[PDB]
Amino acid sequence: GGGSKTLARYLKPYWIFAVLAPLFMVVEVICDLSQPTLLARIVDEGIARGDFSLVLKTGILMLIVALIGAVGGIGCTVFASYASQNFGADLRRDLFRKVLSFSISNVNRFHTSSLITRLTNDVTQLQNLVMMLLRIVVRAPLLFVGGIVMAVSINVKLSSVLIFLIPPIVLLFVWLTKKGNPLFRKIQESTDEVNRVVRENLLGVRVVRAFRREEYENENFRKANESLRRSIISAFSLIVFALPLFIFIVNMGMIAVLWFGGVLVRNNQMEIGSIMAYTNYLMQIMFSLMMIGNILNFIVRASASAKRVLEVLNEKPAIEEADNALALPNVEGSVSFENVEFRYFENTDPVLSGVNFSVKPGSLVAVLGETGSGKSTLMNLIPRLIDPERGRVEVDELDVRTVKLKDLRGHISAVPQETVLFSGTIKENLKWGREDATDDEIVEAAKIAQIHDFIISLPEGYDSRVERGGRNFSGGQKQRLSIARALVKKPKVLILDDCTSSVDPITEKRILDGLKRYTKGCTTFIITQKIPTALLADKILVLHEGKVAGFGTHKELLEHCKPYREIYESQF
Amino acid sequence: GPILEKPALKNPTATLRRLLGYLRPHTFTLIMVFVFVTVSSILGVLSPYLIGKTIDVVFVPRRFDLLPRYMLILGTIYALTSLLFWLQGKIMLTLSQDVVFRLRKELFEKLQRVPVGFFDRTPHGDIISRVINDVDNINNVLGNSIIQFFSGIVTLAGAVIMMFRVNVILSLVTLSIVPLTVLITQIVSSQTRKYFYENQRVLGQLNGIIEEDISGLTVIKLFTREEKEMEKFDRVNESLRKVGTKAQIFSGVLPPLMNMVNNLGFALISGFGGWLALKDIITVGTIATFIGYSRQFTRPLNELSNQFNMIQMALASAERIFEILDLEEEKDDPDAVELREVRGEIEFKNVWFSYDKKKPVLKDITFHIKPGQKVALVGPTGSGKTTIVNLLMRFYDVDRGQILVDGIDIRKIKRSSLRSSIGIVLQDTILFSTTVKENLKYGNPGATDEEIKEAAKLTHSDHFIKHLPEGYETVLTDNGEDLSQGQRQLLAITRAFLANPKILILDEATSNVDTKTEKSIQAAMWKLMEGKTSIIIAHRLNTIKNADLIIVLRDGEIVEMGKHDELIQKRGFYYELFTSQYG
């Protein structure tokens, strides 16, 4: 269970960058720690000893040490950049390949929204995490440890100061984090409530306004407002006390250096230069310890990203083609269910159970039922997007679990209620079913779909521009565009939902009539909840609560099939 | 991060004064904070000077009897500097917080009064995003950026004044890094900007491909597009690999560079400083002091620039917010009238309307609905039958012609009294995130917990209501997401009942409704519509057959008008619109 996949394989091929980044960074750190030792030498061995060479020579030396340290840095950043960016690219790619293999069963485990955030944000956090590991995670702890090492080497005894300075700071960081985390969580809660009241008051403005109840929403917003003022004022009152207290401890620490160091120079144990470097070291230790405080905070969140990304990588696709799957060079379009029991989530009740039906090639079958009857699972089962728990689904009397998926889906067109187009042109979209389709063929399909005249009125016609997701076309325009997109594919089975956009104008009837001329050599399921729509079909599959209720014509079904009678009563 | 372009503020000083009047009631408190930063910044440039003096008065002449007096002066100086960092932050925290707390009342109240059109025109997600961001932008600048800028200025000027009055040669030496900083900072920030945006471009593209391919995954599979989509991803991904590297490099090298400039400052001060010391021109403490200022001319300069741009940006944000607060609000007429108790007759006189004023939506619409009459509005998508609802509620005003309830023109009726007499149930119903009881009570504040039941009993809603988990006090999370759509429409019908309107405008969907509720809702409509004038955007056969008047619409023009049997007998457009449906 779980999975043995690991995101340390995405950094592995750029390991050289992963070693030069932190190496180069130690050169910066050593050069940064060189500086105060060289200063102390200018005064304890240069100034105090009257020689200009010393001062001049170590002075020239300090410049060189600064130019060198600068390379180490820029170096570290160059390499860490490559290491991280390549890691990100490779991770992202495998993430995307994973999702392109997912079934509906996989996608429902995560959510489509969460899946999006894992392949976007979560990728960039790990990219940063890797950057972070290769630079300040090397920089800060070496300055801290090194500064202590230097301090101790300068005067072991004075270093006792650090024992009194570091524990109170660490404890300050613990206490802040422990007492801070609930309050900042409280902010996000109040922030959200502020967003809840503004959103509902926008989306429902027509209701609150018509109900003469706007002041109640002012009253409502006040509470969310006053709460956001408090949760923020309280969280940050800590922060605004945190920082100044840190500065003091650092300061008061330097007081401890001068004072304690004062007795040591009187006792001929420390030169004044050493006291001067000790201050410069004291501050490198403290401010680096603060950076370490920050690194820890990012690690824990970034870690959550590592888990989500890993769940996706470790997920096995629910629909697998068999090793010796049957090729389907053609399909006649006969379709049967044999005792199909189906359910999207193992928690809930069965969406279908004991569903038996068969459809001869070329039939125009209306699949009629109310919401939740299971009529909408058809679109998912016939092409193999899900597999039944029990029973089998067949196309051309073949279990769809036996045939190649490319061949099977290549012959079946499904037009769901909610349509999705992709960036590019209307023509590119319409050609999704066949690249080699001629414009005449596309125009034919669009004409049947009753969308050709709309396309042709646009300034750039068919080469007109489709924006992301198809978000710039209306609902009924996307729907027909999706219908045309299906027809160009030349499907041998055609599954259409919602009849058409729920109570579409009379032109809905034209598309139906127009399909009837085309469905010669196409088995066509039209999943409607409308009696009139089901009347255009050769035969009606009536579904009630998961079990097939009846399967025939209106006159038959109006006799026996009780659900059909109940439906017909509501519509007439 | 890197700013795109400088904000085109339409005379900032004018909106600056306006903004400077929000925090006006706390002037004294704002002056008190401003002297704090001054004395907290000045005290902070004194510290490295005293350390040099301490080095010069106690350590060098071996006068360690003077050490406690110096350590006490520093120690208290330190104590005061950190005690003013708490103060001048604790005060600005609430002051700033109160300022925006107001801005949220004002913007939100502006929302209640602002015409619907503003909401109808712009995608809701964006107005909340821009406004909120504009607001934080204020908050961050009023609570932080302003004092950090000022504090930086007093600190910078302080450290410079003291440097020159200690030694001039050394001052010119350390201040020689300033040209270096500026030159480095500028050259690097120019590349950081260029590659940040080129990266953001590709990243936005790559993410688009990801968001649309995941949301439409099913369509990719049915069309066996996995390979092609993989290709489209790859070329963009490989393009991001190369650009991100450049973006991440240039955004990364400025700190080592700044730190290098720091190390160079440290060196020159130690060389020239030590050399001057050998020449008895300066003292050792003087070198210690100049070390203390040696990082005051790198990052704190950058801070100054960035804080300034943040301040500049905040003014643009203030300008947008002030324009929203300047928008015109819906108001009644001075002679607007309350609604006398009438049974509600409706008339449209040659009315014309358009949303963009370029593309006509309604034309010459004339009809007369007498009290108690059930009226059906039928027609294709674009008939404009969905626009009539808005005009009669006066969400939009007519271009030409006149609409009138009970004879009196609608534009001369109090908007308060109109929306009570006239009720409304829309196809896209809106429930709130409160309990069932609070939703039904919404139409009538003073409704008892017995009349809510009684009315819900009468519209077949009360049944499922008590069958819900928490019953009548079931908090409908995410606007009734866990409800049967029929149940939602039943609740919408029930709450429209409790507002006791004398004119009812219905639009009841049929899409994903189960037959069981369906019988109930059309029964509920009937109890709703009785004793009321009812203009129905009908979808059901039993309402158009039982309507007293049908108004067939097409292209925003009334093509036909009459009863069901007559309009079928005419065999006109209503025939086509009907027989091609229930034929």
UniProtKB/Swiss-Prot annotation, chain B:
CDD domains reported in the protein's UniProt record: ABC_6TM_Tm288_like, ABCC_Glucan_exporter_like
Cell location: Cell membrane
Organism lineage: Bacteria, Thermotogati, Thermotogota, Thermotogae, Thermotogales
Gene3D superfamilies with a match to the protein in the record: ABC transporter type 1, transmembrane domain, P-loop containing nucleotide triphosphate hydrolases
Regions that span the bilayer: 31-51, 71-91, 141-161, 168-188, 264-284
Presence of the UniProt keyword Transmembrane helix in the record: yes
Protein name, UniProt field: Uncharacterized ABC transporter ATP-binding protein TM_0288
UniProt main location, coarse: membrane
InterPro entries: AAA+_ATPase, ABC1_TM_dom, ABC1_TM_sf, ABC_transporter-like_ATP-bd, P-loop_NTPase, Type_1_exporter
Keywords: ATP-binding, Cell membrane, Membrane, Nucleotide-binding, Transmembrane, Transmembrane helix, Transport
Residue span(s) of domain ABC transporter: 346-580
Pfam families, alphabetized: ABC_membrane, ABC_tran
Family: Belongs to the ABC transporter superfamily.
One GO molecular-function entry: ATP binding
